[PDB]
Each structure stands twice: as C-alpha cells, then as structure tokens.
Design a protein around this ligand. Structure first.
Ligand code: HEM
Ligand code: HEM
Ligand SMILES: Cc1ccnc(CCCCCO[C@H]2CNC[C@H]2Cc2cc(C)cc(N)n2)c1
Ligand SMILES: Cc1ccnc(CCCCCO[C@H]2CNC[C@H]2Cc2cc(C)cc(N)n2)c1
Ligand SMILES: C[C@H](O)[C@H](O)[C@H]1CNc2nc(N)[nH]c(=O)c2N1
Ligand SMILES: C[C@H](O)[C@H](O)[C@H]1CNc2nc(N)[nH]c(=O)c2N1
Ligand SMILES: [Zn+2]
Lengths: 411, 407
C-alpha cells in the first residue's frame, strides 16, 4: 500500500509507506473520524513481541540487523522476561527509544529537532528526594541561562502498576491558580485543582498571579512529596511590547522552559510513567493560548481596552488586533532577553522541511493537522495547506490519567 | 457507538447518537486518520430511495402511515418499470435542505432550513440553464440583502446526458498566464479560463474579469453565456483608517455560489445544483487575498503599512492579514452587502450544533474546515470536539467535467 499526500499551495505530492508499521489504533473507523477528539499492568504474553519489534528497529537503525549482537540481545531479553517478567533497556536503547518517541509524536511541530535530545537516565532513582534532585539538574541543564537545550529525564519504568514513579505536575514549571469566593480566578485557571492539592499537601501559597508551583513527586508508588524548585533555577521573562510602553504595566511574565511532565513514554513494551521532557516555546503557545484562551489568563479585553479598539462589534476584529500585538510582545520580550523562542512562521516552515525529509528517508511522518496548525493565522502558515496522515508509531508518548484520580493513598 | 464530544473551554459535553445513521465511509481506518485530506442499477436504487422516504415521512410525522406506504409502493413500481423515479416537490425541498443540514464542512448551517429551492427539473437546454441561473443570481443577491438558494437541474439518467455547470462557482474572476511568467488575475482559474477562451470567449485580459458561464445540458457539449453585468454585485475594497487601501484596486463579488457539486437525494443524483449563501469575511480576506497561490497580496499591503519585513518574528504577515480582513468586512458593511465575520459565524455554529445535538442527536462537523483560517483559538469552534461522518441527502465533490466529457 502507498498513500499519497498533497500540498495544495505547492502541488507537491508525497508517498507514505511508513503507516504500514502502525499497529496502535486511531479512534477513527470507516464510518466516523475522531480527528478532533482530544483523547481518542502488562503480562509476559504481550511483552516479548513488543520487545522484539523494538529491538529489530533498534538493530536496523544501527545497521546490525541479524548480527550476532542482535540475536544475543533478543535471546537475553527473552530469558529476562521469562525469569523476571520484565527487562531492562541498555543505555543506547533508552536513548534511541526516547528520541524515537519524539520523532513519532504526531502532534509536535518541533520535530526537526528530534535527533538533538539530551537523555538523562534516572533509572537508579528510588525516592522523591532523588527525583527532585534529578529534576533540578534537568531544569538547570535545559535552561542553560536562556540558551535552551532539549532534554528528557527518565525515571524507573512501571513494574506491577503499584509502584509507579509519577510527576504529579502536568509541566515542571507552571503558575498557581486560586479560585476566589466571588467566582473569579487569581493566576492560571488551568491549575486550580492541582494548586488545591498542593495546598492540601502543605504548600504555603503566596496567592499571587504568577506563583511558580512546587513539584509534587511520587516515587515507587509512595504518596507524593512537595519540593520547591530553587527560584534561581526558574528563568522568567517579563512581557513588554516594542512600541506600546503601557504593555509592561499589565504585569505579565512567563517562564522560559516548557517541560511536559505528565506523559507516558512507551519503549519496547516498557512503560516509563515519569519522563519529563522540555524544549523551547513557539510564541503562540504563550501569546495565543496561555494569554488569550477564555479559560486561561484571558487578557484580550484588557489589551484591546488599552489599545482603544472599537470593542462595540466583533467585526471590527478587535480581538484579532489585540491578539497580534500580544504575540508580537512575547516574541520581542523573549528575544530581547536572549531566551530561545520560535515564531509560528519559522516553526511551521521548518516542520514542512522536516516532514518532506522524513517522507524521503523514512517513508512518512505521522502528523496531526488539528494540532500542528498554529492557533492564530492558520492559512498563512505552510502547514495549513499540507495534507497529513495521522497514525501511531512506537516508541511513543501517551496521555495518562492524572495520578490524583488513580493513586491509592497509603497515609 | 454512543459517543461524547466535549468543549474544552466550557466543559459542555454532548452525546452523539446520530452517527448510527451514518452511511457513507470517511477515508479513515482504525490505523490511519485521513481527517486532513481534501478528497478522501435498480438493485441499489430502491434501498437508497426507501431510506430517504422513511426519513421524509418521519420528518412530517406520518411514519408507517398509509400515505408513507403508498408512496414507497409508488416509487418501487416506478424503479422496476422505469429504472429510476421522480421526487415530489415536497421531497426535493426537504432533500435539498437536508443535504445542507448534513454538510459537515459548512459553518453556516444554522441557516439550513431557510433555503429557497428552485426546481429546474423541467429545463432541457443550456439556454434554459442560463435563464434559471440569472434568476437565481438575482433572487439571491436581492440588492445586497443576500438570500440562500439552490437551483436544481434534471437528475442523472444513464450518465451520458448529465447537466453540468462547468464553472466551480457561478461568479469567479479569470486567470491568465503571462509572457512575464507571473499570473494575471486569479491563479486558481487559469485552466478554466483557457477552456473559455478555447470555446470562443473574448477575454478582456484584466485582473477582475467575471468569467462566462459554461453550461452543459442533456450531456451535450457546453455553451458560453455571459452573466448580465448588472446582476453581478461587486464591492470595491477600502480600509476605514488606511486612506491608501483603495489604491490597491481590489474588489470582490458579493455572491458565493458553488456550482460544481453533486446533490444526492434518495439515491438520485443531481449533477448540476448550484447553490449560494453569503460570505464569511475570512473566505475573501484570508484565502482569496492572502493565499500564496491566490491573489497573494500580503507583501504589498505589508509594504504600504511600512512594517518590519526583515524577520518573520515581527509578525508583519499577521498584522497585514488582520487589516485586510478588517477592510473586507468594512467594505461589505458600508455597501450593505450581507457578510458575516468569523467570530459571529462560529458562535452561531456552536449554537446550531447544540440545537442539533438536542433535537436530532448529533451534528456532523469537520473541524479542519469549520475552524477559520485566521485566529483559530479565539473562536469557540477551536475548543469544540466534533465528530465527522457522512449522512445522506448530501452534497459531494465530483470530477471536473472537462476531464470526463467526450467532446
Ligand atoms: C525543540 C522545541 C520544541 C518545540 C518548539 C515544540 C513544539 C510543540 C508544540 C507547539 C506543541 C503543541 C503544544 C500545545 O499546543 O499544547 C508540541 C507538542 C508535543 N511535543 Fe513538542 N516541541 C518541542 C520539543 C519537544 C520535545 C523535546 C519533546 C519530547 C522529547 C516533544 C514532544 C511533544 C509531544 C509528546 C507533544 C504532544 C503533547 C500533548 O499531547 O499534550 N516536543 N510541541
Ligand atoms: C448562509 C451563509 C453561508 C455561510 C456563511 C457558509 C459558510 C461556509 C464556509 C465558510 C465554508 C468553507 C468554504 C471554503 O472554505 O472554501 C462552507 C462550505 C460549504 N457549505 Fe456553506 N455557508 C453558507 C451557505 C451554504 C448553503 C446555502 C449551502 C448549500 C445549500 C452550503 C453548503 C456548503 C457545502 C457543501 C460546503 C463545503 C464545500 C466544499 O467542500 O468545497 N453552505 N460554508
Ligand atoms: C517540549 C515542549 C516544547 C514546546 N512546547 C511544549 C508545551 C506543551 C504544553 C502541553 C499543554 O497542553 C495541555 C493544555 N491543553 C491540552 C493539555 C495536554 C493534553 C491534554 C489532553 C486531554 C490530551 C493530550 N494528549 N494532551 C512542550
Ligand atoms: C454557499 C457558500 C457560502 C459561503 N461560502 C462559500 C464558498 C465556498 C467556495 C468553494 C471554494 O472551495 C474550493 C477552493 N478550495 C477547495 C475547493 C472546494 C473543494 C475542493 C476539493 C478538492 C474537495 C471539496 N470537497 N471541495 C459558499
Ligand atoms: C477540540 C480540539 O481538538 C482541541 O481544542 C485542540 C485543537 N488543536 C490544538 N492544537 C494544539 N497545538 N494544542 C491544543 O491544545 C489543541 N487543542
Ligand atoms: C490540507 C487541508 O485539508 C486543506 O488546506 C484545508 C484545511 N481547511 C480548510 N478549511 C476551509 N474552510 N476551506 C479549505 O479550503 C480548507 N483547506
Ligand atoms: Zn479520522
């Protein structure tokens, strides 16, 4: 089978054969597409196949397919699984695995960078204090005083599902949200429930608009523990605008390091339930979503108010006007402070080049159009006009349930 | 099989039962989503007809009635005897409204029940087709107060006698490839413009030349007609604050009227069914004007605004895009030609989708097409999970006739 994808701007046509390596399911059927749905304890049985399939990929990538080293490693993993019911990855396999989970992440527009990933093997970690130390080193290494470097830290894999390592924060660095008695929210409304859990666990909340949350860390299935990231390790950027002097007085800032901490990394059948990873921002993640979603900081009105836009009718495009200015301000601020950031024009152009290169050398690039297209200015970016095929390859990053829903408290 | 969609901004959760009536296939499988792909006998005819008449009689609350049974029997006899059948006027009107109600890529469906249907099944010649079309254009334009309409020409018989409107829309501008190497006018219309010229059209060779209609009746070779110029309402584009904007020399037409689709009702195929509503501003301001392969005007507008074009991160493109779209909306509003902005349209679509979930058990919606091509996430449709599936009656895309037609 060959599937073709067209670009409607360039008329470039690509042929995908890689989708033939897909096994996981999409959510879609013959009768129903679920492409815009956000969300569409293993035994030995399922395991050796997953292991073998991963190891065959690994050994092909390094041009050693079928070699003695390849065969002995299959043999070795086979026997490890029968004797212990699981197995351990070699460092080189873990690194290759983590790189490929990113390469395979179909909602990631930043994948041109996939092969440049610093992998911190934290599989020797046993306690939450150990996790905290690991995460500080990650944050410091990745921050690099503004010159951001992609990185991932990988904690011990799942065993019986009763001893999971988990980072309870959704990202390593986020701002607290506090729901007020009058129904308004102070700070980030996306973090209210998590902030409540931190408070209940003993965090002394400053109750401001940009309070960096404490890490809440679960090791070996134990109850999680609170730690404050050292403030000197949290790089932040005050947001100002190049032409509008009043913009700074909105009191806005953001942190420099985007670091997803709630996902599951699957490599060769093994499950790494705590695998925080970080890169750098595309400007719209902050300027469009973080600042301008109604359920987030929601600053559009106040900005358009300061700009004296005609707010009487939507068709003055006052929201679109304020939206561009805010996004200009975020890119300007990060740039002036020398904190790595990419704009959505540059990021999407790089992605199309990456995607074409992947079609040529790999036979495809799974891509989720719903997520890859930026949330402003969609059609003046080259990805809008690009047909994409979304399917699931392993190694992979997966969503997992928030741990407060599933954790059995020990006391 | 019983599905939930969530809006992530409002936490509103809707249950879809309507997908169970899904009929056609999507392009997707359990292994590959094709959500972003643009194009993903008497035996079969009776099931198709019954399925339709059942939903018709159910809609008028006479399901299982004597009138229902009698009609089903009537239609059955007609197929076995004549190999096809004819829709009653009421069935045609119902079917056309429902094909619009079912159009998963249409954001304007809150309007679906207010559709004027023109029954042109009595038409026999291209000249007749032209007369019907002018009347459609004039009815729908309504001196700027636009009214939704569809004109339905005779159904396909043996496939050798198709009615087709060769144009993709009733009103579009010509495109000409130049000795220069650049394109004059609308680059999307170069091939069709050459067919017009090949067929006799004397092209003015300008940037905004309304194309002639190329009409095919009873599967004959198509013929050329000019829409009377006084029936084509156009809007000159100016900006409310930039004096220089009008000097770009831009205009657009008021009536968007898609004329290349196939309407399928109860298994019958209406290969010529041009239909029209009114524009959402972004369709012109973002796509017609700013697409690289369309009028591609971003650079020239950016220049007159004196923006910093040295680096993409000044967001000059985004700035210019907003002003072009302000100018479109302003111009149409000033000349009193119906238009809707993308905020207002997507808000109405969210209201429409809620009515539909409550009253019909779902609403098929293609998120990739529903979300406007600028400012995605400040419109409510961005945060709204949607299920896409194919219900009949339906509008379908069909092969350009020049690739099909034996001359
Ligand atoms: C080099 C800098 C990177 C940039 C500019 C970038 C860009 C982005 C953006 C804009 C998104 C969508 C996020 C959203 O809308 O919430 C995303 C998603 C994602 N990226 Fe990246 N990315 C980068 C690096 C990384 C790294 C290092 C990884 C892991 C190794 C990664 C894996 C993912 C995954 C798994 C998603 C989907 C997340 C989800 O489902 O919530 N990306 N990327
Ligand atoms: C009343 C005002 C209407 C508005 C504001 C509107 C809005 C839109 C928009 C913005 C699109 C996307 C088109 C594109 O991006 O190229 C679209 C597509 C479409 N609409 Fe509507 N619509 C209207 C009326 C109608 C009517 C009257 C019909 C049929 C009776 C219809 C059926 C369709 C179909 C079948 C599509 C998809 C066309 C394709 O696949 O190329 N719409 N609509
Ligand atoms: C490494 C990197 C580089 C550049 N940017 C980033 C930022 C990613 C931040 C992710 C925040 O996304 C949050 C907010 N909305 C959906 C949610 C993530 C999510 C939610 C759900 C239900 C499913 C899913 N797959 N992913 C990370
Ligand atoms: C009735 C109405 C109301 C408001 N707006 C409109 C404008 C729709 C104009 C149609 C323009 O669409 C053209 C340009 N890009 C895709 C193409 C239509 C199309 C192309 C293809 C390959 C498949 C498909 N289903 N539809 C029509
Ligand atoms: C409902 C819909 O799938 C949801 O709003 C999606 C759309 N596209 C997105 N794209 C990105 N990058 N991030 C998101 O959170 C979303 N949200
Ligand atoms: C490849 C992708 O499907 C294509 O560019 C789509 C995206 N969304 C669209 N949405 C609308 N309304 N109209 C279009 O023409 C397109 N083009
Ligand atoms: Zn799909």
């Amino acid at each position: 089978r060959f599937l073709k994808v067209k670009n409607w701007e360039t008329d470039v046509v690509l042929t995908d054969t890689l989708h033939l390596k897909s096994t996981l399911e999409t959510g879609c059927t013959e009768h129903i597409c679920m492409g815009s749905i956000m969300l569409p304890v293993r035994t030995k049985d399922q395991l050796f196949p997953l292991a073998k399939e991963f190891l065959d990929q690994y050994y092909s990538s390094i041009k050693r397919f079928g070699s003695k080293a390849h065969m002995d490693r299959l043999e070795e993993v086979n026997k490890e699984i029968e004797s212990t019911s699981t197995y351990q990855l070699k460092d080189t396999e873990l690194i290759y695995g983590a790189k490929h989970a990113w390469r395979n992440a179909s909602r990631c527009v930043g994948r041109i960078q996939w092969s440049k990933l610093q992998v911190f093997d934290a599989r020797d970690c046993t306690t939450a204090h150990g996790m905290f130390n690991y995460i500080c080193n990650h944050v410091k290494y990745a921050t690099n005083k503004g010159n951001l470097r992609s990185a991932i830290t990988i904690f011990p894999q799942r065993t019986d599902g009763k001893h999971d390592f988990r980072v309870w924060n959704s990202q390593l660095i986020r701002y607290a949200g506090y729901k007020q008695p009058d129904g308004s929210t102070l700070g980030d409304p996306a973090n209210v429930q998590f902030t409540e859990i931190c408070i209940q666990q003993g965090w002394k909340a400053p109750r401001g608009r940009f309070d960096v949350l404490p890490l809440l860390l679960q090791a070996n299935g134990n109850d999680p523990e609170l730690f404050q990231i050292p403030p000197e390790l949290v790089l932040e950027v005050p947001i100002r605008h190049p032409k509008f002097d009043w913009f700074k007085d909105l009191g806005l800032k953001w942190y420099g390091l985007p670091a997803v901490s709630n996902m599951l990394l699957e490599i060769g059948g093994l499950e790494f339930s705590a695998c925080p990873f970080s890169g750098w921002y595309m400007g719209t993640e902050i300027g469009v979503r973080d600042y301008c979603d109604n359920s987030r900081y929601n600053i559009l009105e106040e900005v358009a108010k300061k700009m004296d836009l005609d707010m009487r009718k939507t068709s003055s495009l006052w929201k679109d006007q304020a939206l561009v200015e805010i996004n200009i301000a975020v890119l300007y601020s990060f740039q002036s402070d020398k904190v790595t950031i990419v704009d959505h024009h540059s990021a999407t152009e790089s992605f199309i080049k990456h995607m074409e290169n992947e079609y040529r050398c790999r036979g495809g690039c799974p891509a989720d159009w719903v997520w890859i297209v930026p949330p402003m200015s969609g059609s003046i970016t080259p990805v809008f006009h690009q047909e994409m095929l979304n399917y699931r390859l392993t190694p992979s990053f997966e969503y997992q349930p928030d741990p407060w829903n599933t954790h059995v408290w020990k006391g």
